[PDB]
Amino acid sequence: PHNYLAVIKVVGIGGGGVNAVNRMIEQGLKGVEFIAINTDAQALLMSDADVKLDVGRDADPEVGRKAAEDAKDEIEELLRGADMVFVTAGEGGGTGTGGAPVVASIARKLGALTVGVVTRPFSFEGKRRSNQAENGIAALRESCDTLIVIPNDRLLQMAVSLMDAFRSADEVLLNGVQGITDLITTPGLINVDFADVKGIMSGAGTALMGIGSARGEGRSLKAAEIAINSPLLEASMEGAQGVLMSIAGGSDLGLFEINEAASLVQDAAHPDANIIFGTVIDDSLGDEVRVTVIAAGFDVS
Amino acid sequence: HNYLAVIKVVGIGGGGVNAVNRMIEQGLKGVEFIAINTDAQALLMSDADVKLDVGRDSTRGLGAGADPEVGRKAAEDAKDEIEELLRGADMVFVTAGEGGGTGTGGAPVVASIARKLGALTVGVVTRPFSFEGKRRSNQAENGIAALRESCDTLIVIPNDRLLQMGDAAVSLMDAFRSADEVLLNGVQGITDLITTPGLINVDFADVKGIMSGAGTALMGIGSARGEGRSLKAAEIAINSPLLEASMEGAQGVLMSIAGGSDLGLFEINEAASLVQDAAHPDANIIFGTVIDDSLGDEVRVTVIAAGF
Numbered sequence A: 001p002h003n004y005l006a007v008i009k010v011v012g013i014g015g016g017g018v019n020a021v022n023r024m025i026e027q028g029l030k031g032v033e034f035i036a037i038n039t040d041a042q043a044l045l046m047s048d049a050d051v052k053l054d055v056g057r058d059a060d061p062e063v064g065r066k067a068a069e070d071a072k073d074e075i076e077e078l079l080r081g082a083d084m085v086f087v088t089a090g091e092g093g094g095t096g097t098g099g100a101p102v103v104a105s106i107a108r109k110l111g112a113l114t115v116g117v118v119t120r121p122f123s124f125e126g127k128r129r130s131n132q133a134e135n136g137i138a139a140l141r142e143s144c145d146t147l148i149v150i151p152n153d154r155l156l157q158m159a160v161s162l163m164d165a166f167r168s169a170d171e172v173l174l175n176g177v178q179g180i181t182d183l184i185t186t187p188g189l190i191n192v193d194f195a196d197v198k199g200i201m202s203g204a205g206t207a208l209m210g211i212g213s214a215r216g217e218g219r220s221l222k223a224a225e226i227a228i229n230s231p232l233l234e235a236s237m238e239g240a241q242g243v244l245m246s247i248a249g250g251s252d253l254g255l256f257e258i259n260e261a262a263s264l265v266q267d268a269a270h271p272d273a274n275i276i277f278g279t280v281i282d283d284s285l286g287d288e289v290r291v292t293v294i295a296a297g298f299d300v301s
Numbered sequence B: 001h002n003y004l005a006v007i008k009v010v011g012i013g014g015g016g017v018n019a020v021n022r023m024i025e026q027g028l029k030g031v032e033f034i035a036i037n038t039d040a041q042a043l044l045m046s047d048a049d050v051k052l053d054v055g056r057d058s059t060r061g062l063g064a065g066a067d068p069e070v071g072r073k074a075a076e077d078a079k080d081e082i083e084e085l086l087r088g089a090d091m092v093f094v095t096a097g098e099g100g101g102t103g104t105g106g107a108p109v110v111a112s113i114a115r116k117l118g119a120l121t122v123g124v125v126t127r128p129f130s131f132e133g134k135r136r137s138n139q140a141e142n143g144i145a146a147l148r149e150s151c152d153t154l155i156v157i158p159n160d161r162l163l164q165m166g167d168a169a170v171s172l173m174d175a176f177r178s179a180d181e182v183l184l185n186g187v188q189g190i191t192d193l194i195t196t197p198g199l200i201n202v203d204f205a206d207v208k209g210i211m212s213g214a215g216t217a218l219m220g221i222g223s224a225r226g227e228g229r230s231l232k233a234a235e236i237a238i239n240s241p242l243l244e245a246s247m248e249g250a251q252g253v254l255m256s257i258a259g260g261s262d263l264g265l266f267e268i269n270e271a272a273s274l275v276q277d278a279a280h281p282d283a284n285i286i287f288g289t290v291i292d293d294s295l296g297d298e299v300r301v302t303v304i305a306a307g308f
């Protein structure tokens, strides 16, 4: 599936996934195609995504899986020609959890680089029966090139109130897509080869994410140090066999400070890691920079 | 506190969704608008930020047939989904016209979810006009009782009182537009204190303090222009037919006065002094101001009375 404009499709499925996609649209995530797949028969969350599919008209993960399988031909036509496909059921469970692995499985058989994004709920939300959430991860993992896992519990170490906890979760979920897609789609001083992104993420397994932000003097080293040490990475970093790092910032981000952060991440990473590094121009940020680190794979000693 | 409060306004059922459309058309700022209904077509014409169609198999997109139990089940069936839309709100408004199936039965579900999450939860609903018939009146009564259980504060506006206000409504359509406007005035009279304060700043913490667990409430509205406007608008508000002449009895009162950026303390204080004198001798009264540079020489007073 060769392209020089990388075709990136972002699929939100189920109520939480469509809601995640609506937030990306509302925040102006650029360069990707949004697809909203509703999986529930009794309700429909509307969306401004350019492409929409209501497979429900026909809160169990099993119900979502069969609804998605029932619509496999339509989903495939929707995904055909993508170089990369993100799939997420977003926050909360339900039918989207059963549908996401089917979308992933189809994207991968098509040859797209297939990236799942899945959240672990906060421990205080309790647990609905049969271990559903943890079976959704395992199903998603069997059919993704890379599954990015966001353990929401680790956000309470980044003092957090309940509303702040929920909002922090929504924002890091949006970053699990945007951090990577911006690096591919929006030019910075340091640009990356999509084939290198593919070499890092194809068949790579589960990955964790870290984020950091800083302003003013020494901002790049500071934000990179926060990101590399993020509790959301759960110390995945020293074993990771593949590391992707993106620095978003204004047009005036200097080569020297860019290179300082690049050097820090190479020191932090396993000696044998592939490291993909680049920058993103976002003039809306003033003097803030924002760093995303994706750490994929594991040390096998 | 420098805290940025997140406010979500839910309209559920046809009347609630039309009220939310009116809030959007009048430029109410600082809040996210959510529309919930049992009719995919009506929702298509909503301008809300989030639109959720519920009860699709039970109603097949034609509303609850005036049956509140149908509306309750459609909302409850979509509880996890509604909760994920509300997650993160500091304050939630639930607005509807009581008396039909979708709003009557579904509003208490929305409010219970928001309350369980700990958001300050404010209902703003109408009673149907008496000419709509006794079944709608009874259904609304029951829906209001259920909603009151789920809200921190529930503001109830009787549509019958609207007919004693303003000019004689030409037509059913204009009367319901008047209902839309008063539901907007009830939401905006509170949220603009938080989102666009004037000289006397009443913030989210202050509003939570007086509206948490306050119970059933009434509203009055008044506006005037030119010389003596603040005293005039405040007197209209506290005599409002909507307040059912209950200002004297209220032990909790929130008042907001909106005016241009040149609304000054003398004027503000003249209106507050008027309202203090008409209030219960033990009333807790919070006075706040709103900047609204679109108003001209006009000021708008809103009074929320609770604690009877």
Ligand SMILES: Nc1nc2c(ncn2[C@@H]2O[C@H](COP(=O)(O)OP(=O)(O)OP(O)(O)=S)[C@@H](O)[C@H]2O)c(=O)[nH]1
Pocket: B012, B013, B014, B015, B016, B018, B019, B038, B062, B063, B064, B065, B066, B067, B096, B097, B098, B099, B100, B101, B102, B103, B104, B126, B127, B128, B129, B132, B136, B159, B176, B177, B179, B180, B183
């Ligand atoms: N504010 C406002 N209220 C309305 C409007 N139309 C009707 N109402 C009031 O709202 C009440 C409930 O009507 P409506 O909201 O349309 O029903 P519903 O909740 O959607 O219930 P349904 O599914 O059985 S049709 C009516 O009895 C009437 O008093 C409107 O356009 N704006």
